[PDB]
Write an enzyme that holds these catalytic residues in place. Sequence first.
Site, PDB file in Angstrom:
ATOM      1  N   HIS A 103      55.796  34.496  59.047  1.00 42.51           N
ATOM      2  CA  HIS A 103      56.753  34.609  57.923  1.00 42.51           C
ATOM      3  C   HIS A 103      56.148  35.511  56.852  1.00 42.51           C
TER       4      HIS A 103
ATOM      5  N   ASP B 200      60.369  68.305  49.204  1.00 41.95           N
ATOM      6  CA  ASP B 200      60.008  67.227  50.145  1.00 41.95           C
ATOM      7  C   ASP B 200      58.713  66.597  49.655  1.00 41.95           C
TER       8      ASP B 200
ATOM      9  N   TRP C  58      48.291  33.623  56.633  1.00 40.56           N
ATOM     10  CA  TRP C  58      48.273  35.108  56.568  1.00 40.56           C
ATOM     11  C   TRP C  58      46.899  35.592  56.067  1.00 40.56           C
TER      12      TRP C  58
ATOM     13  N   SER D 108      49.118  53.221  58.227  1.00 41.35           N
ATOM     14  CA  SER D 108      50.420  53.718  57.756  1.00 41.35           C
ATOM     15  C   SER D 108      50.413  53.859  56.228  1.00 41.35           C
ATOM     16  N   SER D 109      50.011  52.796  55.529  1.00 43.92           N
ATOM     17  CA  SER D 109      50.039  52.719  54.059  1.00 43.92           C
ATOM     18  C   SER D 109      48.955  53.585  53.431  1.00 43.92           C
TER      19      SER D 109
ATOM     20  N   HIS E  62      44.416  40.523  46.070  1.00 38.36           N
ATOM     21  CA  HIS E  62      44.970  40.556  44.685  1.00 38.36           C
ATOM     22  C   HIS E  62      45.635  41.918  44.440  1.00 38.36           C
TER      23      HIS E  62
ATOM     24  N   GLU F  71      46.986  43.772  46.471  1.00 36.20           N
ATOM     25  CA  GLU F  71      48.190  43.735  47.317  1.00 36.20           C
ATOM     26  C   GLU F  71      49.361  43.071  46.564  1.00 36.20           C
TER      27      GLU F  71
ATOM     28  N   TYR G 222      49.981  43.087  43.384  1.00 33.77           N
ATOM     29  CA  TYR G 222      50.460  44.071  42.387  1.00 33.77           C
ATOM     30  C   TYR G 222      51.155  45.238  43.111  1.00 33.77           C
TER      31      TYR G 222
ATOM     32  N   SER H  93      62.886  49.211  35.509  1.00 32.00           N
ATOM     33  CA  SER H  93      62.938  50.100  34.324  1.00 32.00           C
ATOM     34  C   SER H  93      64.149  51.031  34.445  1.00 32.00           C
TER      35      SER H  93
ATOM     36  N   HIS I  89      39.979  34.258  41.796  1.00 27.38           N
ATOM     37  CA  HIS I  89      40.897  33.160  41.405  1.00 27.38           C
ATOM     38  C   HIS I  89      41.587  32.585  42.659  1.00 27.38           C
ATOM     39  N   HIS I  90      41.467  33.243  43.814  1.00 25.50           N
ATOM     40  CA  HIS I  90      41.914  32.700  45.126  1.00 25.50           C
ATOM     41  C   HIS I  90      40.833  31.805  45.757  1.00 25.50           C
TER      42      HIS I  90
ATOM     43  N   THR J 141      51.490  42.889  30.949  1.00 23.25           N
ATOM     44  CA  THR J 141      52.734  42.425  31.635  1.00 23.25           C
ATOM     45  C   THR J 141      53.791  42.078  30.583  1.00 23.25           C
TER      46      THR J 141
ATOM     47  N   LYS K  92      55.662  45.002  29.215  1.00 23.70           N
ATOM     48  CA  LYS K  92      56.763  45.460  30.075  1.00 23.70           C
ATOM     49  C   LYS K  92      57.984  44.559  29.889  1.00 23.70           C
TER      50      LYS K  92
ATOM     51  N   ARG L  28      50.148  22.607  50.688  1.00 26.16           N
ATOM     52  CA  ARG L  28      50.790  23.685  51.471  1.00 26.16           C
ATOM     53  C   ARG L  28      50.250  23.671  52.907  1.00 26.16           C
TER      54      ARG L  28
HETATM   55  C1  HEA Z   1      54.484  39.811  43.144  1.00 22.36           C
HETATM   56  C2  HEA Z   1      53.389  39.221  43.555  1.00 22.36           C
HETATM   57  C3  HEA Z   1      52.521  38.551  42.591  1.00 22.36           C
HETATM   58  C4  HEA Z   1      52.346  38.792  41.224  1.00 22.36           C
HETATM   59  C5  HEA Z   1      52.805  39.911  40.383  1.00 22.36           C
HETATM   60  C6  HEA Z   1      51.397  37.717  40.824  1.00 22.36           C
HETATM   61  C7  HEA Z   1      51.000  37.625  39.452  1.00 22.36           C
HETATM   62  C8  HEA Z   1      50.036  36.671  38.966  1.00 22.36           C
HETATM   63  N1  HEA Z   1      49.459  35.691  39.742  1.00 22.36           N
HETATM   64 FE1  HEA Z   1      49.849  35.183  41.613  1.00 22.36          FE
HETATM   65  N2  HEA Z   1      49.996  35.051  43.622  1.00 22.36           N
HETATM   66  C9  HEA Z   1      50.784  35.680  44.513  1.00 22.36           C
HETATM   67  C10 HEA Z   1      51.640  36.770  44.148  1.00 22.36           C
HETATM   68  C11 HEA Z   1      51.711  37.318  42.838  1.00 22.36           C
HETATM   69  N3  HEA Z   1      51.072  36.829  41.759  1.00 22.36           N
HETATM   70  C12 HEA Z   1      50.630  35.264  45.895  1.00 22.36           C
HETATM   71  C13 HEA Z   1      51.270  35.748  47.132  1.00 22.36           C
HETATM   72  C14 HEA Z   1      49.670  34.184  45.808  1.00 22.36           C
HETATM   73  C15 HEA Z   1      49.194  33.311  46.968  1.00 22.36           C
HETATM   74  C16 HEA Z   1      48.360  33.904  47.985  1.00 22.36           C
HETATM   75  C17 HEA Z   1      48.174  32.869  49.058  1.00 22.36           C
HETATM   76  O1  HEA Z   1      47.324  32.001  48.817  1.00 22.36           O
HETATM   77  O2  HEA Z   1      48.855  32.953  50.123  1.00 22.36           O
HETATM   78  C18 HEA Z   1      49.343  34.184  44.394  1.00 22.36           C
HETATM   79  C19 HEA Z   1      48.386  33.276  43.937  1.00 22.36           C
HETATM   80  C20 HEA Z   1      47.796  33.288  42.645  1.00 22.36           C
HETATM   81  C21 HEA Z   1      46.570  32.469  42.293  1.00 22.36           C
HETATM   82  C22 HEA Z   1      45.703  31.631  43.215  1.00 22.36           C
HETATM   83  C23 HEA Z   1      46.196  30.178  43.098  1.00 22.36           C
HETATM   84  C24 HEA Z   1      45.569  29.299  44.183  1.00 22.36           C
HETATM   85  O3  HEA Z   1      45.653  29.632  45.381  1.00 22.36           O
HETATM   86  O4  HEA Z   1      45.046  28.188  43.840  1.00 22.36           O
HETATM   87  C25 HEA Z   1      46.402  32.715  40.894  1.00 22.36           C
HETATM   88  C26 HEA Z   1      45.186  32.271  40.116  1.00 22.36           C
HETATM   89  O5  HEA Z   1      45.008  32.626  38.958  1.00 22.36           O
HETATM   90  C27 HEA Z   1      47.469  33.655  40.507  1.00 22.36           C
HETATM   91  C28 HEA Z   1      47.694  34.091  39.108  1.00 22.36           C
HETATM   92  C29 HEA Z   1      48.654  35.113  38.846  1.00 22.36           C
HETATM   93  C30 HEA Z   1      48.659  35.650  37.508  1.00 22.36           C
HETATM   94  C31 HEA Z   1      47.919  35.180  36.300  1.00 22.36           C
HETATM   95  C32 HEA Z   1      49.594  36.722  37.582  1.00 22.36           C
HETATM   96  C33 HEA Z   1      49.953  37.626  36.461  1.00 22.36           C
HETATM   97  O6  HEA Z   1      49.927  38.988  36.924  1.00 22.36           O
HETATM   98  C34 HEA Z   1      51.303  37.221  35.817  1.00 22.36           C
HETATM   99  C35 HEA Z   1      51.618  37.895  34.464  1.00 22.36           C
HETATM  100  C36 HEA Z   1      53.015  37.628  33.972  1.00 22.36           C
HETATM  101  C37 HEA Z   1      53.371  36.843  32.960  1.00 22.36           C
HETATM  102  C38 HEA Z   1      52.405  36.003  32.169  1.00 22.36           C
HETATM  103  C39 HEA Z   1      54.856  36.682  32.583  1.00 22.36           C
HETATM  104  C40 HEA Z   1      55.311  37.815  31.658  1.00 22.36           C
HETATM  105  C41 HEA Z   1      54.566  37.801  30.335  1.00 22.36           C
HETATM  106  C42 HEA Z   1      55.045  37.541  29.103  1.00 22.36           C
HETATM  107  C43 HEA Z   1      56.513  37.180  28.857  1.00 22.36           C
HETATM  108  C44 HEA Z   1      54.103  37.634  27.912  1.00 22.36           C
HETATM  109  C45 HEA Z   1      53.616  36.412  27.208  1.00 22.36           C
HETATM  110  C46 HEA Z   1      52.882  35.475  28.141  1.00 22.36           C
HETATM  111  C47 HEA Z   1      51.818  34.749  27.810  1.00 22.36           C
HETATM  112  C48 HEA Z   1      51.151  34.796  26.495  1.00 22.36           C
HETATM  113  C49 HEA Z   1      51.193  33.854  28.834  1.00 22.36           C
HETATM  114  N4  HEA Z   1      48.407  33.843  41.520  1.00 22.36           N
HETATM  115  C1  HEA Z   2      57.708  38.948  50.026  1.00 24.99           C
HETATM  116  C2  HEA Z   2      57.191  37.830  50.377  1.00 24.99           C
HETATM  117  C3  HEA Z   2      58.017  36.640  50.674  1.00 24.99           C
HETATM  118  C4  HEA Z   2      59.430  36.406  50.742  1.00 24.99           C
HETATM  119  C5  HEA Z   2      60.535  37.319  50.416  1.00 24.99           C
HETATM  120  C6  HEA Z   2      59.503  35.011  51.163  1.00 24.99           C
HETATM  121  C7  HEA Z   2      60.739  34.366  51.361  1.00 24.99           C
HETATM  122  C8  HEA Z   2      60.913  32.991  51.697  1.00 24.99           C
HETATM  123  N1  HEA Z   2      59.893  32.108  51.862  1.00 24.99           N
HETATM  124 FE1  HEA Z   2      57.940  32.456  51.945  1.00 24.99          FE
HETATM  125  N2  HEA Z   2      55.961  32.872  52.068  1.00 24.99           N
HETATM  126  C9  HEA Z   2      55.368  34.017  51.742  1.00 24.99           C
HETATM  127  C10 HEA Z   2      56.040  35.167  51.271  1.00 24.99           C
HETATM  128  C11 HEA Z   2      57.434  35.375  51.153  1.00 24.99           C
HETATM  129  N3  HEA Z   2      58.308  34.393  51.408  1.00 24.99           N
HETATM  130  C12 HEA Z   2      53.936  33.956  51.907  1.00 24.99           C
HETATM  131  C13 HEA Z   2      52.922  35.024  51.603  1.00 24.99           C
HETATM  132  C14 HEA Z   2      53.637  32.650  52.339  1.00 24.99           C
HETATM  133  C15 HEA Z   2      52.321  31.955  52.593  1.00 24.99           C
HETATM  134  C16 HEA Z   2      51.994  31.959  54.108  1.00 24.99           C
HETATM  135  C17 HEA Z   2      50.692  31.169  54.366  1.00 24.99           C
HETATM  136  O1  HEA Z   2      50.520  30.063  53.816  1.00 24.99           O
HETATM  137  O2  HEA Z   2      49.781  31.710  55.040  1.00 24.99           O
HETATM  138  C18 HEA Z   2      54.974  32.049  52.334  1.00 24.99           C
HETATM  139  C19 HEA Z   2      55.144  30.713  52.687  1.00 24.99           C
HETATM  140  C20 HEA Z   2      56.359  30.000  52.560  1.00 24.99           C
HETATM  141  C21 HEA Z   2      56.427  28.538  52.599  1.00 24.99           C
HETATM  142  C22 HEA Z   2      55.279  27.569  52.658  1.00 24.99           C
HETATM  143  C23 HEA Z   2      54.954  27.191  54.113  1.00 24.99           C
HETATM  144  C24 HEA Z   2      53.814  26.147  54.160  1.00 24.99           C
HETATM  145  O3  HEA Z   2      52.981  26.114  53.171  1.00 24.99           O
HETATM  146  O4  HEA Z   2      53.707  25.397  55.159  1.00 24.99           O
HETATM  147  C25 HEA Z   2      57.833  28.246  52.439  1.00 24.99           C
HETATM  148  C26 HEA Z   2      58.385  26.883  52.351  1.00 24.99           C
HETATM  149  O5  HEA Z   2      59.533  26.641  52.006  1.00 24.99           O
HETATM  150  C27 HEA Z   2      58.502  29.548  52.400  1.00 24.99           C
HETATM  151  C28 HEA Z   2      59.926  29.720  52.256  1.00 24.99           C
HETATM  152  C29 HEA Z   2      60.538  30.957  52.041  1.00 24.99           C
HETATM  153  C30 HEA Z   2      61.977  31.032  52.052  1.00 24.99           C
HETATM  154  C31 HEA Z   2      62.872  29.846  52.221  1.00 24.99           C
HETATM  155  C32 HEA Z   2      62.242  32.390  51.807  1.00 24.99           C
HETATM  156  C33 HEA Z   2      63.524  33.126  51.684  1.00 24.99           C
HETATM  157  O6  HEA Z   2      64.430  32.509  52.664  1.00 24.99           O
HETATM  158  C34 HEA Z   2      63.988  33.104  50.246  1.00 24.99           C
HETATM  159  C35 HEA Z   2      65.245  34.094  50.208  1.00 24.99           C
HETATM  160  C36 HEA Z   2      64.938  35.584  50.465  1.00 24.99           C
HETATM  161  C37 HEA Z   2      65.480  36.299  51.469  1.00 24.99           C
HETATM  162  C38 HEA Z   2      66.400  35.623  52.363  1.00 24.99           C
HETATM  163  C39 HEA Z   2      65.113  37.738  51.693  1.00 24.99           C
HETATM  164  C40 HEA Z   2      66.196  38.667  51.618  1.00 24.99           C
HETATM  165  C41 HEA Z   2      65.852  40.132  51.869  1.00 24.99           C
HETATM  166  C42 HEA Z   2      66.290  40.856  52.892  1.00 24.99           C
HETATM  167  C43 HEA Z   2      67.097  40.288  54.029  1.00 24.99           C
HETATM  168  C44 HEA Z   2      66.007  42.343  52.901  1.00 24.99           C
HETATM  169  C45 HEA Z   2      67.251  43.163  52.695  1.00 24.99           C
HETATM  170  C46 HEA Z   2      66.962  44.654  52.807  1.00 24.99           C
HETATM  171  C47 HEA Z   2      67.635  45.644  52.162  1.00 24.99           C
HETATM  172  C48 HEA Z   2      68.685  45.341  51.177  1.00 24.99           C
HETATM  173  C49 HEA Z   2      67.160  47.082  52.337  1.00 24.99           C
HETATM  174  N4  HEA Z   2      57.595  30.621  52.518  1.00 24.99           N
HETATM  175 CU   LIG Z   3      45.309  37.109  42.930  1.00 27.16          CU
END
Ligand code: HEA
Ligand code: HEA
Ligand SMILES: [Cu+2]
Lengths: 102, 56, 227, 72, 49, 513, 40, 44, 137, 44, 70
Positions: free
Chosen positions: F61, F91, F126, F156-157, F240, F242, F244, F255, F290-291, F316, F319, F438
């Site tokens: 997934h 291009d 993953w 690719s990337s 991390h 990734e 962003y 924007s 932090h992971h 952030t 923005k 989880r």
């Molecule tokens: C789009 C993807 C994306 C983005 C942008 C972020 C953004 C952030 N993530 Fe998250 N993160 C994930 C995707 C993302 N994360 C994924 C996939 C995991 C799990 C990986 C896994 O284990 O599978 C994860 C897990 C993850 C962890 C590990 C948790 C754990 O496993 O125990 C932590 C720890 O600090 C973290 C922190 C943050 C923080 C601080 C930001 C910051 O960048 C957020 C900043 C934004 C805001 C704060 C809101 C806007 C701000 C304002 C309105 C201003 C005023 C706000 C304040 C004064 C607070 N995230």
């Molecule tokens: C981009 C990242 C992304 C997206 C979109 C999603 C989408 C969803 N995910 Fe998640 N998910 C992850 C990233 C994502 N996930 C990751 C990283 C993990 C952790 C894996 C691990 O633990 O190792 C996770 C794990 C995770 C869990 C935890 C499993 C566990 O801990 O045992 C659950 C549980 O409910 C869940 C649910 C969902 C559901 C219900 C949706 C969706 O059904 C929500 C609705 C969104 C859609 C249906 C997508 C629609 C978009 C399209 C169809 C594209 C269209 C294209 C064009 C228009 C060009 N996902």
């Molecule tokens: Cu991180």
Amino acid sequence: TDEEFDARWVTYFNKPDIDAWELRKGMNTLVGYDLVPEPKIIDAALRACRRLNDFASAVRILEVVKDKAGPHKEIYPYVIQELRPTLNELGISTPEELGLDK
Amino acid sequence: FENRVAEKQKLFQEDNGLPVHLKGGATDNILYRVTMTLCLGGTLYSLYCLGWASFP
Amino acid sequence: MAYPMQLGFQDATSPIMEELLHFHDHTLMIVFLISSLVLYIISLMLTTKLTHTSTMDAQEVETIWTILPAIILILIALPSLRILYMMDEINNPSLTVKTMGHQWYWSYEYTDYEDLSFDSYMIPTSELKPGELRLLEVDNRVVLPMEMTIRMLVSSEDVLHSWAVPSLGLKTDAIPGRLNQTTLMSSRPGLYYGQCSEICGSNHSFMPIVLELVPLKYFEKWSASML
Amino acid sequence: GARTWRFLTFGLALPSVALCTLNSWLHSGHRERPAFIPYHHLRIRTKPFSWGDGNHTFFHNPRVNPLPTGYE
Amino acid sequence: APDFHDKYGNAVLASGATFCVAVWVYMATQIGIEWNPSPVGRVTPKEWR
Amino acid sequence: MFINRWLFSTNHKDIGTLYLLFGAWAGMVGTALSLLIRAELGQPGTLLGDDQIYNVVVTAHAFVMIFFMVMPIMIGGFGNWLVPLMIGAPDMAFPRMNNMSFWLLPPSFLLLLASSMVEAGAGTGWTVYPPLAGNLAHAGASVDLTIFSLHLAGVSSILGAINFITTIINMKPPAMSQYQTPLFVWSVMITAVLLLLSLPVLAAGITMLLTDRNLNTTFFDPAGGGDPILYQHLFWFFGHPEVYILILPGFGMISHIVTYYSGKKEPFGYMGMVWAMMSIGFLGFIVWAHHMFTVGMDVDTRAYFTSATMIIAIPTGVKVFSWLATLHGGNIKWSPAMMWALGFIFLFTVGGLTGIVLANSSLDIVLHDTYYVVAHFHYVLSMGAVFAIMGGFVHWFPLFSGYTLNDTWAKIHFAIMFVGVNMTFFPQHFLGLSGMPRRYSDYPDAYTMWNTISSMGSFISLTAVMLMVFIIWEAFASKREVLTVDLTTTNLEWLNGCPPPYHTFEEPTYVNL
Amino acid sequence: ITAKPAKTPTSPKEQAIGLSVTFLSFLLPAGWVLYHLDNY
Amino acid sequence: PSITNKRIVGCICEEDNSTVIWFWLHKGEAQRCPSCGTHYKLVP
Amino acid sequence: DYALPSYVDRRDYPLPDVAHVKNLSASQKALKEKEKASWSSLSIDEKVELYRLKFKESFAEMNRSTNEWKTVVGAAMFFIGFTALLLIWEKHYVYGPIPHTFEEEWVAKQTKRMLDMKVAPIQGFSAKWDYDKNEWK
Amino acid sequence: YEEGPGKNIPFSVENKWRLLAMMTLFFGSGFAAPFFIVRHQLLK
Amino acid sequence: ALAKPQMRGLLARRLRFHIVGAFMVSLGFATFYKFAVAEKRKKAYADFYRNYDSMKDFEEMRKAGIFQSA
Ligand code: HEA
Ligand code: HEA
Ligand SMILES: [Cu+2]
Ligand SMILES: CCCCC/C=C\C/C=C/C/C=C\C/C=C\CCCC(=O)O[C@H](COC(=O)CCCCCCCCCCCCCCCCC)COP(=O)(O)OCCN
Ligand SMILES: CCCCCC/C=C\CCCCCCCCCC(=O)O[C@H](COC(=O)CCCCCCCCCCCCCCC)COP(=O)(O)OC[C@@H](O)CO
Ligand SMILES: CCCCCCCCCCO[C@@H]1O[C@H](CO)[C@@H](O[C@H]2O[C@H](CO)[C@@H](O)[C@H](O)[C@H]2O)[C@H](O)[C@H]1O
Ligand SMILES: CCCCCCCCCCO[C@@H]1O[C@H](CO)[C@@H](O[C@H]2O[C@H](CO)[C@@H](O)[C@H](O)[C@H]2O)[C@H](O)[C@H]1O
Ligand SMILES: CCCCCCCCCCO[C@@H]1O[C@H](CO)[C@@H](O[C@H]2O[C@H](CO)[C@@H](O)[C@H](O)[C@H]2O)[C@H](O)[C@H]1O
Ligand SMILES: C[C@H](CCC(=O)O)[C@H]1CC[C@H]2[C@@H]3[C@H](O)C[C@@H]4C[C@H](O)CC[C@]4(C)[C@H]3C[C@H](O)[C@]12C
Ligand SMILES: C[C@H](CCC(=O)O)[C@H]1CC[C@H]2[C@@H]3[C@H](O)C[C@@H]4C[C@H](O)CC[C@]4(C)[C@H]3C[C@H](O)[C@]12C
Ligand code: CUA
Ligand SMILES: [Mg+2]
Ligand code: NA
Ligand SMILES: [Zn+2]
């Protein structure tokens, strides 16, 4: 200052040989600002419309004055009060007089 | 060796509508056909291998 | 343990979990306020016929937008780090217990004085005694003295596991070849539950942790009986 | 260009200095001085210093710099 | 010049809302879903030991 | 002619179209996997009767949604379509290498689907942490096929990042400085820099895992003096950045969308938006541990990673406030794309804030490896990425196709999706706080109510996905050809019509100094 | 955005057909597998 | 200059503007930038 | 058409780049000739006709509110209702029985054992039991 | 190469019903695949 | 005759008024939340432990049969 801003826009619309492009550019620029243009500015823009033989644009300028006021209902009737002598002099019908307010 | 770049410029600029990968002549066609046949045949073989490996 | 329809943390069983509850309450108030402000401002921006579409100067407002968030983050970090350094502070433990993770059960070693060790397996649903909890009970609980500082050492004999007890504020990864330390102190007697918290294969969901906290006199009687 | 280096000055370099200023500020304040031990490899006196009474270092701080005979 | 919304909007809103509530209520109450609500103020504790 | 055009492409638009089709297909796979997850959890007990298969489904997934849906759509699709148009370039810099970045993805996906079909699959998460991912606990080909899938995706990337950085630096009009490029173009350049630096480190780490599995290396095996925690550092050093990478192009599209539907010529605070994206990109490389707050690192290391992570909120927030200030004073067009963008701003904010909660190592002890983390990233990543994608898709569909969507259908689609994702993920916060781990196939009985509701939410989002396919069909079926769009003076990608000709900017733009 | 009238307008009935076929293409295969999980 | 009868102009109205104003310039009478009014004339 | 100035009704762009009506009949051309003399000599109907040559919609027209929200909200509720049909199907044909620990007697025993071990005694659970009166508070 | 709406795509939109079949096969195949892979693993 | 209404800065005036209103509401929420949540919780823990007898608690659990070891 407000007075200097208003004077510059009066001068802009008062240029005798203002062309159609300049009339449009002036109104389209002015309505970007956070203000409803002063009657002295609208008076000058309506007289530009007269020099450009453009009755429709004169009506449109009255519509966009009303529009810029948003919910501030008192602004448009005040502006029409101040413009009444010019509307009478140039034969400009208001959007309300024309039914264009639906 | 002698500088024969002008002769290659003339060959590769000939107005014959060929894409650059075929513009050298019949040998380009042979090498392209060998490459594409190995790639496509290899890919079909990889899918067969997947089918085999997907079961005990 | 958790109860049905629970919204927040399990009730704190240790002083450090109490601290975490207070710190979460503080932080959640900020999260709520910022979330609410952003939603409110969206609604404010979208609910007027008034317009201003010419270029706007950004300099003045960006000072507010950077300084105010910086202050808020400092106000979160100060108490956050105070708790971090409390949970590291030198304690004199009176007891050390080891736990080893396995696919899929925990073993426990009490080797301060006697070589006591045992395995701790989930009770299958088909074997639960009436009123016992599905996926949470074990055959051999971790008997420990209450109101005492305990050193837990955590490792694994195979893959990664993670030894967790939410109501005590505990989660320590179990890594083969590594001996990770945490401190445990329960304010109360009772049974405290947790679950393996690093994916370790097909039975990750099924290797729970159960602490049994009893007065020192009963802990000593239990230790003496094990000879 | 100048615009890019100004962007780096105000957007990365000065913010770094502000963060490190914050970090230093927070960890300021006097730590408890260690027991004096008259180690022979420290408080070296092979010739009197050419200032004061000959026995004080140039930026002597009475709070943290013991003399050969201990804290003042 | 009445559009699709002028002609059908009232019917779409009333029928959609009525259908949505009726089917979710049926799903929630009539097909044996276990919600496992809190036993607080609901369950009489019974001797287990 | 069909093979020349679609297999042998050197055209940025056709390659962008291939990426959008690929990504949409991948999204169906990812969605199906997500519904299987939520079906297993939708009542207490076992559905699949095989927890190894559950773990394979969770693993697949994530890989499908990240590597085959989000990155191909945002970077390969919108990036290839829009970046050359937005800078008046004929291009990409390397138009033939661009085609190989695309054609590496079907083989990459085939290797992932081979991993799941051979032996018992890669039930690893993953993250693919050893020793679970090693040759004892995951004997056989599945994990090696997963590693190879990631190698091809990574190549690719990396080649795509080289192409985008070169294009953006080298192929603007000679008068156009970097500070006269649109924010979407900035967002792609910054994303590409993160890919170029992060993916090679992942490649090193998964190569080490490959050699530990097959060549008797012991990078991660304590018997040979290795360390499973080294793998985690190498993985998260990539992972991390990734996250962003997954959001930055989304920030760029948001924007453009907010500016366009506010009736503005420009976003509020352009240079602040550039500053914020570059700041996020830079800080994104210094926060990875932090992971790893529960693996046993030193207290001072935890203190540093807490503090560094919290800093990301400042750029952030600039923005988020800048998007609000772009709405301010707008003549708001309540288009479906605007609805997607407003949903983004709010849902991204919620997820970012739960990220700040998690940044606090102390509290992370209790929240790590719980549904709190799952809730955090499904808000910020899953909803954030998907809402930005759907906003960009409904905004630019007319440019790419030449046809209009039905706006009322598109608004219905938005409304259904908004309800479904919030019903799915909001309750996962309660499950996390109350201690549900989880990566579980089943849960203690206390957690039943919020799992039941979450699984019901997942079906609402499925209804939205099915409706989206119908909406695209209806647009191609009806053939309403675009004539005009507003604001072309500040949206260059529209000025060659809909769709633009195969070759655009044969005669470049004129821009003087 | 402004557009030409549809070259090939899609009537309400045509939309009901397209929507139905779309929904069935997702639901029937998944439904078949989920119904037969016992048999597996 | 153009090899044809129209060309896209981008106008950076003031030095250091980030916003470029884009429009087709046609053969014939000079056109004006819709933001700053700067005149442009196509010379096939 | 993409390369030429075009007409737009936008409250913030009141004077578009081109007239709504590009090509005039002889009567419309005579009215534009009439427009060069005193507008006081123009009739109401003629003033409206000049407006309609220049512009497509008035401000009042372009700003009008619609019934579209009813269709969107109603259709969304229909599709959310359709979703519950899928969930009913899933419950009937996919899900088998839940574990015996959800039986009424098991839950009554489990609840007593939770109160006996004082689960969440500060706020969450046992806190809500009156241990003196042997009932829920 | 062919240019314009419906001509810049690797699939035909000449007939809306043939298109519906192709879109059905395309998105349906992707959505179905994980269900059939789960089935394949269970039948082992 | 109609007097001149304010014609300048209407959008800015509206923003200022509602940003101050949002501040005042944030303050009221912080007061509600401190009382309903944070202080409630401090008081619940302090009250629970003020006269808490861990031995009496243990003896009740033991008599109920909860423990393996006692
Ligand atoms: C789009 C993807 C994306 C983005 C942008 C972020 C953004 C952030 N993530 Fe998250 N993160 C994930 C995707 C993302 N994360 C994924 C996939 C995991 C799990 C990986 C896994 O284990 O599978 C994860 C897990 C993850 C962890 C590990 C948790 C754990 O496993 O125990 C932590 C720890 O600090 C973290 C922190 C943050 C923080 C601080 C930001 C910051 O960048 C957020 C900043 C934004 C805001 C704060 C809101 C806007 C701000 C304002 C309105 C201003 C005023 C706000 C304040 C004064 C607070 N995230
Ligand atoms: C981009 C990242 C992304 C997206 C979109 C999603 C989408 C969803 N995910 Fe998640 N998910 C992850 C990233 C994502 N996930 C990751 C990283 C993990 C952790 C894996 C691990 O633990 O190792 C996770 C794990 C995770 C869990 C935890 C499993 C566990 O801990 O045992 C659950 C549980 O409910 C869940 C649910 C969902 C559901 C219900 C949706 C969706 O059904 C929500 C609705 C969104 C859609 C249906 C997508 C629609 C978009 C399209 C169809 C594209 C269209 C294209 C064009 C228009 C060009 N996902
Ligand atoms: Cu991180
Ligand atoms: C903010 C820092 C900037 C430095 C300015 C401060 C002092 C004067 C000038 C410094 C020049 C640099 C180095 C010279 C040598 C020693 C000084 C080292 C730096 C210093 O200032 O050291 C101090 C000692 O100064 C002492 O002895 C004082 C010594 C004073 C006399 C110096 C003798 C000159 C040496 C000759 C130079 C030769 C140059 C050769 C050139 C090459 C030609 C081929 C340290 O104070 P302290 O109390 O011991 O400890 C702190 C306790 N709280
Ligand atoms: C387990 C094993 C898994 C590994 C699988 C390997 C993956 C794929 C198979 C590789 C097949 C390679 C075939 C040759 C590619 C040559 C690309 C190239 O040379 O691309 C050039 C651009 O990249 C440039 O310069 C600079 C970039 C040149 C890069 C060359 C190829 C690199 C391939 C592997 C890289 C991994 C990087 C290692 C770091 C992690 C040319 O760009 P074009 O668009 O072509 O033309 C532009 C025209 O104007 C030229 O006249
Ligand atoms: C449970 C099911 C509930 C029913 C849900 C139905 C949802 C669809 C509603 C119809 O909405 C309209 O469809 C029109 C017809 O396509 C559109 O006009 C479009 O169609 C024509 C183009 O052929 C032109 O007359 C218009 O300008 C053009 O915008 C119009 O925007 C749109 O509001
Ligand atoms: C996660 C996404 C899934 C969402 C749920 C999908 C909703 C259900 C769609 C309908 O699917 C069908 O359901 C039938 C039952 O209603 C099945 O017939 C099965 O049962 C019938 C009645 O018992 C027999 O007549 C048939 O032979 C037998 O295959 C049939 O196979 C299956 O295609
Ligand atoms: C759980 C998530 C819920 C999401 C639900 C989404 C609801 C969307 C409803 C759309 O309904 C319409 O919205 C139009 C715009 O989309 C309105 O345009 C009117 O209102 C606007 C002013 O707010 C103007 O800009 C327009 O010109 C004007 O006609 C119109 O009257 C209204 O019927
Ligand atoms: C005679 C010939 C001239 C080449 C020419 O101008 O065409 C010379 C010039 C430089 C020579 C090369 C260089 O001297 C370096 C090499 C010297 C070795 O002894 C033989 C191979 C070697 C690689 C030479 C091959 C050949 O004799 C070259 C190529
Ligand atoms: C100097 C640079 C570019 C200005 C320009 O050439 O247009 C601008 C763009 C974004 C600005 C930054 C952002 O506005 C965010 C911060 C705002 C604070 O008020 C000052 C520091 C702060 C970190 C700013 C410093 C500096 O003014 C920056 C970095
Ligand atoms: Cu052991 Cu998970
Ligand atoms: Mg973990
Ligand atoms: Na289950
Ligand atoms: Zn200009």
